[PDB]
Design a protein around this ligand. Structure first.
Ligand SMILES: [Ca+2]
Length: 279
């Protein structure tokens, strides 16, 4: 399948090269997989989700995304225009209030929630979780990411936005999950991407068009926008049969565009997520 005049990041993770605008992909498109967006919530009523999205948890007084962040990240995963995995099932978990603030202990609660709940869902092709959030190093936050991953969920986490080595941030520094940095449409590291040997992969994160609340769209920027490209990609690769929740971060790295970003500080991977469909 081909989707012309696509947001640049969907074209990128289907290209070897920058500078084009079609998103080339296999039509199975994540059918039979499940992606949990653990964030401010998802405006499931957005027609771009077409009935595939459900809130299933909150730790606040409403499950609604009253911020838009969770809805945008979820759209990149799996909205019909703006998504990687256009036919995946989306499940929301609201661990952030309507300003973007979550206490750690609640974010932990969300995470163990997914390891349990996946067992309440129909996900024959595999389960992913997408965490576009974080704060300073915590062993506990990191332990809750290793548990979620160990429970057979592909876990994708934002490396962070301080232009700093990510080993000091959580859940990014955790080893066993898939820590995602951000790039731009000219294959530069985005100016705000954390970096450091704990990163596994880079995805598109600067001027990412996606869904927003009210039924609407916007473009924003962050390792948060990069993260759901890798989550959605992993859902897409499960569904096909290329990899598994426990193997997907390694498979994506193995199949990435290798060398191609400029400003990878020394010691940071120079790997860019790629679906290997068109070549
Ligand atoms: Ca890893």
């Amino acid at each position: 399948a081909a989707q012309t005049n696509a947001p640049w990041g969907l074209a990128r993770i289907s290209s070897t090269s920058p500078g084009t605008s079609t998103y080339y992909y296999d039509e199975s498109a994540g059918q039979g997989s499940c992606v949990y967006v653990i964030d401010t919530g998802i405006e499931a009523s957005h027609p771009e989700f077409e009935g595939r999205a459900q809130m299933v948890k909150t730790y606040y007084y409403s499950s609604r995304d009253g911020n838009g962040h969770g809805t945008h990240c979820a759209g990149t995963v799996g909205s019909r225009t703006y998504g990687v995995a256009k036919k995946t099932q989306l499940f929301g978990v609201k661990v952030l209030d309507d300003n973007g603030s979550g206490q750690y202990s609640t974010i932990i609660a969300g995470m163990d929630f997914v390891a349990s709940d996946k067992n309440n869902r129909n996900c024959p092709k595999g389960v992913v979780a997408s965490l576009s959030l974080g704060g300073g190093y915590s062993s506990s936050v990191n332990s809750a990411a290793a548990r979620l991953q160990s429970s057979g969920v592909m876990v994708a986490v934002a490396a962070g936005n301080n232009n700093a080595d990510a080993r000091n941030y959580s859940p990014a520094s955790e080893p066993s999950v898939c820590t995602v940095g951000a790039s731009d449409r000219y294959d530069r590291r985005s100016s705000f991407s954390n970096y450091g040997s704990v990163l596994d992969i880079f995805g598109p994160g600067t001027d990412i068009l996606s869904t927003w609340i009210g039924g609407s769209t916007r473009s924003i920027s962050g390792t948060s926008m990069a993260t759901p490209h890798v989550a959605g990609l992993a859902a897409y690769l499960m569904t096909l049969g290329k990899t598994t929740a426990a193997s997907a971060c390694r498979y994506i790295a193995d199949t990435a565009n290798k060398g191609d970003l400029s400003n990878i500080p020394f010691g940071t991977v120079n790997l860019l997520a790629y679906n290997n469909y068109q070549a």
